Every structure is written in C-alpha cells, then in structure tokens.
Swiss-Prot record:
A motif (9aaTAD) lies at residues 246-254. This is Peroxisome proliferator-activated receptor gamma. It comes from the Eukaryota. PDPK1 activates its transcriptional activity independently of its kinase activity. The chain holds residues 233 to 503 of 505 of the full protein.
Amino acid sequence: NPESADLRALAKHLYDSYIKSFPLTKAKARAILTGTDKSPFVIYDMNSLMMGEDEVAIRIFQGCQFRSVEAVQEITEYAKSIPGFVNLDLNDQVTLLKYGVHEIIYTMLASLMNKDGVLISEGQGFMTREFLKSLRKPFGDFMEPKFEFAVKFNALELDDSDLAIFIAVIILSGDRPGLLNVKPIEDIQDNLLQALELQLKLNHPESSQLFAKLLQKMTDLRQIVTEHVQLLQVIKKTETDMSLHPLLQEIYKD
Ligand SMILES: *[C@@H](/C=C\C/C=C\CCCCC)CC(=O)CCCCC(=O)O
C-alpha cells in the first residue's frame, strides 16, 4: 500500500539515524554478552575492580553519572532526526527531552544487561549484578530496579530496528507536563505509533499483541525513574560531599 510504504520509509529513516547516534547497539551488546575478540573483563569484587583499571560506591556512582550525561547527548542528537521534532516550539523540544531521556536511557540500558550484570565502558567490561548490590547503602540499591525491568523487557526480544521507533514514540509524548502545543506532538507520535505497529507486525509475525505488550512497558519505565529520583534525594542528604552533574540536576527538577 502507498500508505504502509510511507511508514516503512519512516521506520528505515529512524533505524538509520539510531545507528548513527548510538555507538553501542543491542546487536553488538548481545554479540559481546553471548560470546573471542569482543570478550569483556569481569568485575565481581574489589580486586577485580581494581584490576579493571589496568569511596568505591561513589566512584562507581559518578562513573555512571558521566555516562548518563553522554547518553543524554546521544538521545538529543537522535531526537533532532525525528521528522517534525525540530519544527516544534523550542520550549516543547526542551520539555520532551527533559521527560524522555531517562525513560529512554533505561530502555536502551536493558540492551546491555542480562540477569547477571551490565556491560560497561562501551562493552569492554561487565559489572556483576551481585557486586553492584553489595555496595554501601544506599548505593547498593541503585541498580536492582533496572535489572528487574531489563529481565522482563528483554523477554520481548526486540532488536535495534524496533527500538529505534519505540524510543521515538517515547520522546513524542503529548502528555508531558507543561507542553504548550500538544496537537503537533500527537500528530507526530500518531505517525510513529503507526510505523511501530507495522514494524512489529512485519518483524515479529508470530508474536501476538507485541505492540500492546510493548506499550504497557512504558508503565514500568515511569516507575523506575520515579523510584530513581527518590534515591537521589537520599544521596544528596547523606553524601553532601558528593558532586552531581548540572545537566542531570536540571532534568530532575520535575
Ligand atoms: C549507570 C551505571 C552504569 C552505566 C552503564 C555502563 C557504564 C559504562 C561506563 C564505563 C564505566 C546506571 C544508570 O543509568 C543510573 C541512571 C542514570 C544516572 C542518572 O541519570 O542519575
């Protein structure tokens, strides 16, 4: 159909920009995770941690802070590629990014996780879930919620071409707080949803209602972010000497 043909073109466009914006794709993440030249060093305790280089919790926490900032930067680049996005009111572009980056980060982070750990430093390392959970309070509780989501989300078996359209849908949510013009945004998201639906139908013909199942996952993301910000309030009070990146603080004033 000429219609479904316009949707495929959009899917292809989004997939292309996705690959150009995110250096560590799920395809590569899985290749590293499921096993010669791509094998990561494994951090499961203190000595391995110290060897990986070749206050512990705080060192890991800021490292993870730095990457988030980087990720925010990659997501922002990707956003501009979404047709119509740059033509929207500037204030809304900022609002959409403010509320969307973390939901996207956790979505893409699932790509670098399995039930036992996380790929780090661009796949060169793998930090054990057990280790991350042994960290001093309240740091020991920072990643568990993300792993729980990933195990379930990863069960959907989505590939990069699917995720590309899905994160585009996440960014263009007309229900974000403070949006000036909701109409232009919904018209775009509507078009993206149409593209995602077709993509899922064609790429996963035997996966019944994957589309609805993926959309319901948007519920789980919102929870983990809300849960995350609460943990940051604790850190600010117990670690008055620990520094927090400005860009991240500007996004959390919600
Ligand atoms: C961050 C933990 C690890 C980051 C993933 C890989 C590390 C690769 C760098 C080499 C060391 C977990 C989070 O993403 C927490 C939420 C983001 C932080 C925030 O925005 O507050």
